[PDB]
Design a protein around this ligand. Structure first.
Ligand SMILES: [Zn+2]
Ligand SMILES: [Zn+2]
Lengths: 71, 84, 58, 50, 103
RNA sequence: AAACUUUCAACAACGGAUCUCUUGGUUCUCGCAUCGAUGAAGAACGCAGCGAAAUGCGAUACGUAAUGUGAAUUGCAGAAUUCCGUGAAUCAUCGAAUCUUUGAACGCACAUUGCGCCCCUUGGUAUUCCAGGGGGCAUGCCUGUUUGAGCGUCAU
RNA sequence: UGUACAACGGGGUAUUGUAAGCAGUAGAGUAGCCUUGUUGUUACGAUCUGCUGAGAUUAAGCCUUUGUUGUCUGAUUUGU
RNA sequence: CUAUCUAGCGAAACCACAGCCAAGGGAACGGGCUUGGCAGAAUCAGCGGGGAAAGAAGACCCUGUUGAGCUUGACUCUAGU
RNA sequence: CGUGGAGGUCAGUGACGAAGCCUAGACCGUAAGGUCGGGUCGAACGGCCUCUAGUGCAGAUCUUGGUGGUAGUAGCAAAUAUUCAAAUGAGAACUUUGAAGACUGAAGUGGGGAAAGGUUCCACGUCAACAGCAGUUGGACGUGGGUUAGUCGAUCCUAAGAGAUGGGGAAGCUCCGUUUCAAAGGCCUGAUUUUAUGCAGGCCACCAUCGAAAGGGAAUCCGGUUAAGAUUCCGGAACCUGGAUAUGGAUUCUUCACGGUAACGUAACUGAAUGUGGAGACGUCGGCGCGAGCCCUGGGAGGAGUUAUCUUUUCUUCUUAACAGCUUAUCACCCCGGAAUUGGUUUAUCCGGAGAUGGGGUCUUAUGGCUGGAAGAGGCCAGCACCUUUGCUGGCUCCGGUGCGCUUGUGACGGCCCGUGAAAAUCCACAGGAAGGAAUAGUUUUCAUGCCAGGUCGUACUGAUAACCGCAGCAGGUCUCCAAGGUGAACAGCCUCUAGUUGAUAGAAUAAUGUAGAUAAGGGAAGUCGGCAAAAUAGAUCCGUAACUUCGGGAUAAGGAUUGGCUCUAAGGGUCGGGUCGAUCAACUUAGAACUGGUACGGACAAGGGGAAUCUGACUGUCUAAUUAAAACAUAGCAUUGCGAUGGUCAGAAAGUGAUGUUGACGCAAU
RNA sequence: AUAUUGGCGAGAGACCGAUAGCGAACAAGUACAGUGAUGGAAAGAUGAAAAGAACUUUGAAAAGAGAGUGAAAAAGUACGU
């Protein structure tokens, strides 16, 4: 996932199974003050959810994930 | 062959999971579970299945609410603030 | 850009590596003992066929 | 199968997270009778009938 | 790169899961999935086909213009030209015979 | 003659009897009457700093609040004198709350994490479109309110 | 440490059936030349002829050798 | 290819104790008893006389005051019509 | 005599060792049994008088548990087959790499998938157990990573069918029935904002719902990328739906286009209730035509291989997506015209005064061509550098041909039927003419362009001689797609290329008896119940073929001959000048003649034995899954019986209930 | 007044004492089988205290032999006798 971060402009999250690609969009628009453009979700076989968000250019995912604290 | 071959043609279920007991008993050509008629309101139970009436009856599970009533009766079904 | 492994996770929670090994070995052994017992205690009435046809009359 | 439901997948996920050994620190407790995990399951031996 | 596969999960050769091989820019064969052909619109009277009317599939008729679906006449798009001729002669001749019978 | 076979003893093995034990049963007796549409019993899923279970519990998730007790939990790590105190604790007590998805199961359906409708609200140029949040929509029956029907029927 | 033994090689005997390669003025007949020919001549052309009873194989449970090369003290047990 | 010998791996059926014969008698056909003949460790491959060889509380026959499937103008009743 | 427990008692024994257990050590007792010593061991146990029982085992094809002899034995033997060196490691017949040899041989040991399984996928570490030998290996063990969708599917529709409501039955759990004997319902203008309705202003009489990851269906392609994912991601290029909305263009001041004889056309060009029509929407076989992909093949630009000799040689790359614009056809249709000396016409016999032939045109756009996409991508080759990142540079990526070829798609036709070969959602159009509208103005959102959004769940992997089921890592069983070359009629068999595997416990030896496969002198069914088994015959071409017959067959009847290789001849087609002969392209088929050989030649593979008669069943077909495939069953055909619906036959516990019956005696039912 | 093999809380037994007694003294209606209805187990004890064998040495490693803990390894998690 940390490859898709720095290669793309992507973040990869674990999200609540009840969420629907719209709540996710607004959550990232709110908490981290960015502007996504594309979400791709899936369910992992541990019964959790995974969310590949793609951030617009003019937002760098490395600059964001360093601000968070997982690089 | 009525055996070792004809066990090979066994790849489509006549049963799947009931939403009320959670076991593979829901006949699907007809839509009735064989251990608790699910669409039916009553749970399947017969007094010749006295073992089955232990595997499903009260005390088997959590008893989320019913575990507390003997505690509540003893105190008289009181209410309000605990104390000082 | 990595710090963590299961080994460093189980170091704090008691067992170190040699004790993980010495625990796994006996764990496996006690898992195998019961298998030897189950085979012994089933071997009699596993071959007990309800409707064996006995293809022999003449 | 591949074209599966979600109930099924959710149960399979549970069965996955159940398919681990016993954590070794369990065995060091003060009054312990648990030596191994006896509810263990693998696709070769026992099929889970869901 | 011969000996293609399907590209969807219907391995059974119905009318929906037909294929056509194509040689791509990679120089390999690949199976592209066609969709079912389009039958011509027929006439309401004589039951023959219509001349001037595109042969699409039904919900594809919503995306195209009015000219691809009609023709500049009275029963255009729904009836044959000669059926109209037979529909006009009849109407004139009847209504004139009744006049002939009135006076 | 030795090997071999047999018998007995010692020691060692296989195996788990006997002896001793026992937070378990079984039976008798005494007392009490306490499930649920204010959503039961039961089920599915999930929850711990490191747990697969059993026990507990529900997105406030081996638990919160309150009351009493008055310094532990302890497998490890972590906390630490808040320890002459509104305060430790997998403590006890329990009268306040939470209580996922379900289930008589209640919007319709359910081999689907499927499809709707009403009200309030927010955003997107938006009474109509899309999305988010909150609250409702089952059936039978009763008492009552409201509206309406029937040359059944009265007076005018 | 020898008329020793073996691995090879050689010779005999035997079986098969006349090798690859080369040559040919053989070779139905077709295509090229020029005299138009009792083989006129050149190219292909299964095949045929000569070298060629050749070549191949030959003890693995054949015979022979007097050539080449090499080998020849490891272990155990046994007493009137 | 096996069988056979070897390295490794490695079950089962069956089993009163067991395992040389002849005649005798005997539950009337003995591996054991009685009288005789005889008799020498340990054994390998085969074999198919024998062990009234193993498999299966005979299936045929009979008895049972045990049943069942089926038939009929058997006895007693019955749905329906 | 003895055992488990109870009441009394010995002020009983005992951690200085109770109970228990071993003891070819001792004593007593007829005996059941009791006592003692030794060793072991570690916490409770006894004698006596009495009470009380779940009280004493050699057995029960006894119950449970455990262990033996046989036995280091039977035996680990189908699936053509393994070998050398090295690396790793404690250790290699079995791991990895390389070299060799070989197999599947495109109806596969390949590449994907449906059910099903459930993380078996991938990596790192690892060998106690599993892999019936081994193991450093692994579908095992341990830890972890991993499945990205507006376009694929589910979701939506309905089929056979299931199933509530209202109602009716039933003691009742529940049953009938599915629009029925129900007051079964929303939707739009005025009323212009009170939007509650006065009217409106009328619209069938509908009326649940579930049900197909293979039917119906709104919309997607290329390249690249990962340890493991991808029509999902990256890049580029597109489309559909639902909404908003603004300009351009079109049309209009005589409000809702214009042309064309016509079939019809165009960038567009109001059209409500209602009604109608179409698409959705359909069998199967046969041959003919057209296309795509593949196969075959020529020239050229590059690379590799062989080369003692020959080979302008053998192999190999030379590609072009969805989408979009222009054009493109069999059928069908329009205009002019008016046919027998009847013509046109297909492989196939239909078509024409209901207007053929002919001349000129219209449409459908499967499909094909050109261009955009798209060469910038991908591929082939050469060249320069580097563990930075793995890059950079240059060049070529072209023009053709052929066919009873293969698969497949599709069209126009034909045959077959006492068989005539799903529905619904959904979309569109038409008739009708409601209502409405204008001048910088209004309609245009079916013209072009522009703006926004497109949710939820599945998505890894196998799909089987190791991932499913069969007690298992079983020679069994389980749906389907793609499909190369040669031989040859052939997807047969045999060999091979791409791709994949080279796995199945091994070594040595070669006795009997066996399993499987072959041969056999002379005779030739004497064997045997019996020609069981095996053999012989076997393909193609030519000749020749009986009785009997339902006249269709019998029939490959029987019975004969030929078959190779090489050199040749001939006929069979299309182009272009000659036929009111010529150069040229491109064919695989047929016939014939010579020559030739150890008389061989369907040379391996493949591949019918034949005939005369009887019994029986007409035929094809069906059954006893796992002892009987048959003369039995069925069958068409023949006949009989009941029944005219208030009905025949059948059902149901009953019902305002049901099958035949979406029926009606050329029918249904029963024999 | 009577009933009460169920539920909640209490007290007891001339009862069973881990093949017994509830099917279950333990993570038992568990694992597991079967399409499904349903069927349905096994399995208790180291020692007072883990002091659970530091260290040495052979071994590829398991493990071994010495040492050591302990009252006792004739208690070494395969552990009461
Ligand atoms: Zn159920
Ligand atoms: Zn018409």
């Amino acid at each position: 996932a940390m490859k898709k971060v720095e290669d793309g402009n992507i973040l990869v999250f674990q999200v609540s199974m009840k969420a629907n690609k719209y709540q996710i969009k607004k959550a990232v628009k709110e908490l981290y003050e960015v502007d996504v453009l594309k979400v791709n979700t899936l369910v992992r076989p541990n019964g959790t959810k995974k969310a590949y968000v793609r951030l617009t250019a003019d937002y760098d995912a490395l600059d964001i994930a360093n601000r968070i604290g997982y690089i | 062959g009525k055996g070792t071959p004809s066990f090979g043609k066994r790849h489509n279920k006549s049963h799947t999971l009931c939403n009320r007991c959670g076991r593979r008993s829901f006949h699907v050509q007809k839509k009735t579970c064989s251990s608790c008629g699910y669409p039916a309101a009553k749970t399947r139970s017969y007094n010749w299945g006295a073992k089955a009436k232990r595997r499903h009856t009260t005390g088997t599970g959590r008893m989320r609410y019913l575990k507390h009533v003997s505690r509540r009766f003893k105190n008289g079904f009181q209410t309000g603030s605990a104390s000082k | 850009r990595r710090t963590i492994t299961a080994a460093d996770r189980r170091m704090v929670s008691g067992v170190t590596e040699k004790q993980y090994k010495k625990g796994m070995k006996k764990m496996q052994q006690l898992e195998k003992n019961a298998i030897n017992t189950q085979i012994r205690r089933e071997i009699k009435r596993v071959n007990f066929q309800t409707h064996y046809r006995d293809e022999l009359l003449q | 199968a591949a074209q599966k439901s979600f109930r099924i997948k959710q149960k399979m996920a549970k069965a996955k997270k159940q398919n681990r050994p016993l954590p070794q620190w369990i065995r060091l407790r003060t009054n312990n009778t648990i030596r191994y995990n006896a509810k263990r399951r693998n696709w070769r031996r026992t099929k889970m009938n869901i | 790169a011969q000996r293609v596969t399907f590209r969807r999960r219907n391995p059974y050769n119905t009318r929906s899961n037909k294929i056509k091989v194509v040689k791509t820019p990679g120089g390999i064969l690949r199976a592209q999935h066609v969709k079912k052909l389009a039958t011509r619109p027929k006439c309401g009277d004589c039951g023959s086909a219509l001349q001037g009317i595109s042969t699409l599939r039904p919900r594809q008729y919503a995306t195209v213009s009015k000219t691809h679906k009609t023709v500049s006449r009275a029963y255009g798009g729904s009836r044959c030209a000669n059926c109209v001729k037979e529909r006009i002669i009849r109407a004139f001749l009847i209504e004139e015979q009744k006049i002939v019978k009135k006076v």
